[PDB]
């Protein structure tokens, strides 16, 4: 009844990508973008943008979503969604393409923003909120955000249902899904989600207290043992919000020919997680992860181990990987190895790749948007827990970056590593933001940099080509301003 | 079997969308881009460009395809092909959007170049050229261009066979499809072809001594009677080719279960055709039109009504539209009144739109590139024998751009006629070149531009927004420069 | 669009060509060998042989093919395959001979093994496993074997659809087309099909138990019945292919513009079929059959009643013809009464010949090996349930012979049923086989062997003429080695 | 009208192949044979044999015949002609392989033997003799042979002839053709023919006292001069034929609609030409030729240079080829340096090959019986003046052999030179002849006879395979007792 994959894929769809433990994890690296074919529609209005995509890799098909805002890129602005499922495909030539057997267009009056997406055995799931209002709006609304719940089958047919936002959510001032790819766990699909708590309620006095700390590395934070504590406490309270608990949820809804069956959402105390926010659950043959982006101080890329027993949800010591880092504030950037109350910062998230004999993980790959402040010059490279490969370059100079999902996969009959990470790019003309379903395979860096690299860099268009800016570096700051975000 | 198109679409697809004898031809427009879902493909590849463009639009579906090339924009090199299949439906709201159920790519080693494309009932017909060499080496070559005659079928799969030219194009050096594609007439399939002859053979002794020449409207040659004959003549032996005589042909093969079965080559007096260049064969109606591309000294757009009798076809002198107008080197440029020898200009397709009472053609569609010298600010408007409407501009400033393709089909349900138009743009990053089919809808003038009119430009980075270059102007120069052709 | 046959031909084809209740089966006998213009090509290569002949007879064409060892005649070597389609014609003497209007010859990197054709519509359509490795490795892989579904149109041209393996035989480990062909029924095409089951999977569970005797006319096995029994059991996991089910199968794909489209795999019960072996799907006027090889402990040759209903055909218990023997190991040869596992024998196929009055069978004609050991001694003749015919013989002495498959027409015009039977031959210098189609037609032995009997031997020059070799007799044994097999 | 051939050959056929004057004739040798389709048909009859093979290649296509015995060899014997045209194609890998476009096949009343054949700009244009005596019945007939002109057509009918023997042959006793084809020249096609000369009459009384004194190599006659110019004379008597004087004539037909308009009879002076017998004419580019079998005294291959002018042809002194021998009768065999009177031989052509730069001959290409006394060991080798290349054995021992015509051609595309060679081989079970279509490619010397050798020899199993014979070579008699002629 499902469409499943191609020949070649099966057995190495989505599974442990690569274990050895004589090897070193930089020892693979990714080779130059590869040439394929774009399920990621393009831009037609030169009016409005179209960001946040959502993917989910499952063993038989693959879903994928983005947001599309009319008119302005404003978070806010009236908006559509497409979302889409397919499968892996290799043509005669035995190249390799992503396929889209079905997908949708939503064109309605009702709004959806932060819809994640997962890969379930009854089609393509996602969970959106549904947006009447704004951020800070949302906040001042004691009633939880309108969520609902879709499925996209493999008959092509969209069948929606809204879920009870009070009851589930009545500890939540707001309530949005992490944004990321989900992953399907015993018959029940797991989505990450995120959002403020009402001053004094049964979830929030919960929290109360809790907190936790995670240093980068070699240097360690200045400020003495009783100041990385309070920094710590108070990044759960923005000033953004005005004092309001951001707190990391996990909802947890069974997955049945009736939509939005049982749901369950599962709160992971702040002894472990950070400050609320939006990320990915990973599911790589056994293991479980969970990806937090880094809208706290804390930069490096971060997974948590996580399992589930009862509808319920456990966090365990999450992964970090030093040398992949993001953008954000001042106060928190790539370089900040202290606590503090901050946001800023972006959605890279690392998908696991390789790992140990006891099965633990050690090294992944990721997307990585390579700079301190602003958001830019996107890179690709592997990762272990302290540094990174050698990477590839997106172009030269730098150019406008974005949210980017990687992912992962083995061709089993070509015994070959692919990994697609969907990103987000300046799209100048046509509204600012094109995502771009880019292509990539691992390698071994034994052998004889060959003095031929097309991985060096490549052409950017936007800086450069007639009149070289002005070069005092007011362009640094003029680039900075350049990058928006949320 | 066939897909058709959804109940909404059917009644207005392939005919006259609007015939009143009591209405203005500039009182009809186009509207500003309507939003939809991208249909075609966009470049992965951040080295290689993604160019020429095709389309047809049958009673039940649409056919579309374009060429990409793996290193480089140059014509020669070696590229993928990727076409299409797709249906015209509508939303749950009524929005207008083109889907593709089936998509090929083409990966093997045959490189195919100038691909024209026919909807067909029995599927996607595509009639290509397979290059062993380049343009001038194959102009040496006294042996006519190999070529290819596929299928893509409803039911996904895409055959193909290779017809035979030497016997067909025997009195050929050089032989290549119109780009865009031609249509579906009398239980056979026509196309568009133009290429170089045999010097002193049997068509090459036909069309010798043959010309015609067109003016233009209320603007008359100065020159002597006798040297406009002398030049005109010379209009069809341009200097790049070397005394050859570029030629132009459409070529008729019988739509059966067999590819290519029975092909016939329709080879008309240059008593009436122009220097061969690319083109579309276009029904509408009852009406069956052939465009030629300006490739020669007349810039006005050209349509040619064509009849259909045993296999061949002929043709009547053109519908000349001096509205609509193509850049060109500087001896044939929109401006030009008199003959030309030169070779230059670009595909912009008039599509019919307005009719009488008696079945004649008043007036067109289409997106024009706004320049008197190089491809530049492409624009989309409504033209008759000699003046044209308000616009919609693509871009403020002026970027980049190639071949566009126009297409105008009437949504009966609604009784809303819209307008397909498919554009190359400078893409920068990501190859230099994108294809994108923009939207618009017809609409009358009647009324009261109400303040507003966000129709009249839009955004583009690719030349100011650091800097704004040099005043100097030398930046025109370097404009001119942006442009790439052949 | 078909090209159907001669006029004197049309209405003798695929039908029932004797019926009386009056005669006796064996009065009808084959003529001596007959003079006809021959459509089978011989070989060139000195080397390599060419084996393995299918043939199936359409009211409009016919569709033959054979396999070519490019070296040596060991069948995993790589093997070049040529498909042809024809048609009977008369010439100016009336005198009967088969016409090929069209032939492809597949040279290429794939190899093609066991290859079915069946007469279609649309064609030849022929069904053929591609080889990787050898039999012995593929009964070890778990991986049943890639098959292609290509067909030759009246155009002339050949396509190939490669059907999906892995998801229609996913139950065996290896799988292979039954050799002589299938046919045309009901809007999709039928084939004979045989492999290995993985062992408990749905299908082996399914024929778990299930196992059938068929015994010997007038001689029956000493044996007791419990022996019996398990020695039946046993039959169908010889030793040969380690305790795996050797499954009979019936393979239907639906004939359509598209190859291999919708194929449905019928597993008799094992209840009726004996072990899995070669075959041969035949349609006699409104009754359809499979031919089963003897390759395990029975020696008559068997044509199973098959109803189609619903895509998946259903068998009966099988007519038998006792006199019609094949060469078989000791344990299973001409002889063999009781029930034993093994693997032997030679394809030779019955073609139902005459009829009773209720429309069943009655007797048929082929060609048969005669001897009880080894592959030798072509002979052609009647058959019925008990006996044979007077006969006629390929050639004095013995000679290597292989598979046969045999087709009976009548011409209508003249009145006058013939016979054509495609016969494996040793081929001396060459490689050692020589794919021949002799011609015979049948007639009653109401009349006067005049005293000439031409049909009594042919003269082979393989065993004598300048020696005899050495009356020892030890020339039989090695005449039981001057037969290869598999 | 014609078919032509498939484009990667036009340009290889009928021309000087190899133009070396630095290269020596013996360093181009033939491959092992290799492995192509065959497009000659193979016997089904196990009684009579099939023989006599004609072949000519015109760029547009080719034209092949040979004679079918009925019951027995004896060439009185009633026989059926096959006659069919065809087009080189290569395969999807390219593969040189040829094809039979149309054929007939007749099966009347009339006998048609010594069959030549021309491919011609109208068809396929053979010219047979009806025979309704024997060889001596005939030369004791007054009365000329029955002569014919059919023609197979692209149409792919046939049409025929009979031209007046009587008017045109008046001075003959009997007259047949050439056996291999000769070809088409200016609007007219002509044939190799011998014969008997009526006594006295005006063609033989010319022919009186002009005889040819033909000497071999080093190895010269010590007859005297008066013994050797006196058994030259009594070369054109044989006994066979009973004192009449054995001629050589051409033959010239108009080739136009209506068969047999115009026939003209060339016949050249025996002070050049040798005992008359059958042949073959070959144009070879800008040359022509005519190749006269040994039938007489002179051992090594012939070929006269041919010049036409006034539609009667002329000849010259032959090109000679030591190494290129046949077998023969004991006083004429491969050996024989001295003239004589004898009757034997075989018809094994030699095919031009190398040429100089004034395209003069330097040395060809055949397939010889090498032997020096029966029809035995078939081997292709290139030949110059003097000696012989490395060869090709068509097998190892010693295999019964007969007629070989050979032509060769190149192909452009890959740019390589083939050699196709039909020769009479034995055949042992059905019918002790069988004409094959052997396969060669052309190879330069330069190199390293490389330690693997399959063209080292083959394998026949007639001598062989059970008894070794006996080893008292009375073998070598009861061998040269297995070979039949004429
Ligand atoms: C699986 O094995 C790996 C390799 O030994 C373990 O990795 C070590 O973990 C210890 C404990 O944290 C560290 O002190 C070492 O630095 C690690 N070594 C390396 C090379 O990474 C890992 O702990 C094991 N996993 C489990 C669950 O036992
Ligand atoms: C169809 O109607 C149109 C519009 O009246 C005709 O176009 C006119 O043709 C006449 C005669 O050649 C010209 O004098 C006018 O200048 C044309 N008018 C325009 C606006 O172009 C056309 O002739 C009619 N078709 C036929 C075949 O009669
Ligand atoms: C079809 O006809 C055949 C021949 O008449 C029938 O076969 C006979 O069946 C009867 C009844 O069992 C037996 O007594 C005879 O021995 C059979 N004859 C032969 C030659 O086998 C057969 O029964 C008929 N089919 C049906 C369904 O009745
Ligand atoms: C097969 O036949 C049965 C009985 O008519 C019918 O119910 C069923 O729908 C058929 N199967 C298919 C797939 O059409």
Known sequence: GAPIHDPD???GIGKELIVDDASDVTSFYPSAFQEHLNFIPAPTTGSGCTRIPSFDMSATHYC??????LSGCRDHSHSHQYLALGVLRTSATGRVFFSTLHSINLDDTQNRKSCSVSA?????????SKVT??????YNSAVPTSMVHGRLGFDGQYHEKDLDVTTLFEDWVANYPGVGGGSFIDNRVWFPVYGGLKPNSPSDTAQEGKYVIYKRYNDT?????????????????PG????????????????????????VLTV??????????????????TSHFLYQRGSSYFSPALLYPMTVSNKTATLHSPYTFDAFTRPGSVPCQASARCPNSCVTGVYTDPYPLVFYRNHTLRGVFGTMLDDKQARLNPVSAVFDSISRSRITRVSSSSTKAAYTTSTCFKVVKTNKTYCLSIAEISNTLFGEFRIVPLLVEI???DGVRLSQLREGWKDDIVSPIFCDAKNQTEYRRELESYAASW
Do not use: W
């Open 120 to 128: 379930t055995p009854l089609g393509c799931d996602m969970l959106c």
């Open 240 to 263: 953004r919000f005005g004092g309001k608990r951001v707190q990391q949820a996990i909802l947890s809804i069974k997955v049945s020919t009736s939509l939005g069956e049982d749901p």
């Open 9 to 11: 894929y099966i057995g």
């Open 443 to 445: 390698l071994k860096d």
């Open 268 to 285: 992971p105390p702040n002894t472990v997680t950070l400050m609320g926010a939006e990320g990915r659950v990973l599911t790589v043959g």
């Open 221 to 237: 934070c200045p400020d003495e043992q009783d100041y990385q504590i309070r920094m710590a406490k108070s990044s759960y309270k």
């Open 133 to 138: 209002e704004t951020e800070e709006e949302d």
């Open 64 to 69: 994928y979503t983005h947001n599309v805002i």
